[PDB]
């Protein structure tokens, strides 16, 4: 279930934070959040925490496929308890905090970051707020 | 053209905020934020700062035409300089700040409101920030 797209189609990578605010209902459910390129709407960077097994799965789904899955243990979620997820790109990484800490980082594999110009966000998630800003200045 | 749009399928209206902060490239240009329904991307609510002859327009797009224009005695806009806009809807109006100060309120006209699930900006406007906020305490 779609809960939330942003386009923007002047590119959103590198050089804009996302901060997405919200809970997830339940215990045993998941949510995702990708950035999406242009064009044929490839995912450069799908961030996922998967709530039933507590491991976020990141990955990219390049020429209609997913690539190598890159599993992070560290879970800083909790059923129906508020979080605050901020995703910033640089040339080289996405970087993602969560609740004000360094959680992860993935390196680019979709190279053209200025194609990136779709933020979606599906599934388990009831989302307060969404604020897209740009930082590389 | 178009420099962004949101979609939140659930509806963003009423008790949402839209801040966007941005600015003009020119001097004599316009930009506007529309309000879009479902389905069919139906103008519920338009809101168009026109730099040339510094007035704002808001009017709707309903019943197969543009509506009667509600043009704001006053234009608080400078081009080629940053601003913050913030649009709040609640059951009787669309609420318009800019600096947090409110400029104008716009009652609706479009009625189904929690139909009203897409946010574009469209022309000359560089944004720097979106945020569409839900508001906690309705």
Same mark, same amino acid.
């Not at 998967?50 to 990955?59: H, L, M």
């Not at 879970?75 to 959680?103: C, G, L, M, R, T």
């Not at 599934?123 to 604020?131: A, C, F, G, H, K």
């Given at each position: 279930?779609?809960?939330?797209?942003?386009?923007?189609?002047?590119?959103?990578?590198?050089?804009?934070?996302?901060?997405?605010?919200?809970?997830?209902?339940?215990?045993?459910?998941?949510?995702? *959040?990708?950035?999406?390129?242009?064009?044929?709407?490839? *995912?450069?960077?799908?961030?996922?925490?998967?709530?039933?097994?507590?491991?976020?799965?990141?990955?990219?789904?390049?020429?209609?496929?997913?690539?190598?899955?890159?599993?992070?243990?560290?879970?800083?979620?909790?059923?129906? +308890?508020?979080?605050?997820?901020?995703?910033?790109? /640089?040339? /080289?990484?996405?970087?993602?905090?969560? /609740? +004000?800490?360094?959680?992860?980082?993935?390196?680019?594999?979709?190279?053209?970051?200025?194609?990136?110009?779709?933020?979606?966000?599906?599934? /388990?998630? +009831?989302?307060?707020?969404?604020?897209?800003?740009?930082?590389?200045?």
């Amino acid at each position: 279930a779609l809960r939330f797209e942003a386009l923007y189609p002047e590119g959103m990578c590198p050089g804009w934070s996302v901060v997405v605010k919200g809970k997830t209902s339940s215990n045993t459910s998941m949510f995702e *959040i990708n950035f999406l390129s242009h064009p044929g709407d490839q *995912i450069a960077f799908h961030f996922n925490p998967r709530f039933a097994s507590s491991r976020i799965v990141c990955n990219s789904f390049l020429a209609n496929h997913w690539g190598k899955e890159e599993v992070n243990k560290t879970f800083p979620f909790e059923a129906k +308890e508020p979080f605050q997820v901020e995703i910033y790109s /640089d040339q /080289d990484y996405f970087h993602i905090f969560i /609740d +004000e800490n360094k959680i992860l980082q993935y390196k680019h594999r979709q190279k053209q970051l200025s194609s990136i110009t779709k933020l979606q966000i599906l599934n /388990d998630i +009831e989302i307060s707020s969404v604020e897209i800003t740009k930082r590389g200045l």
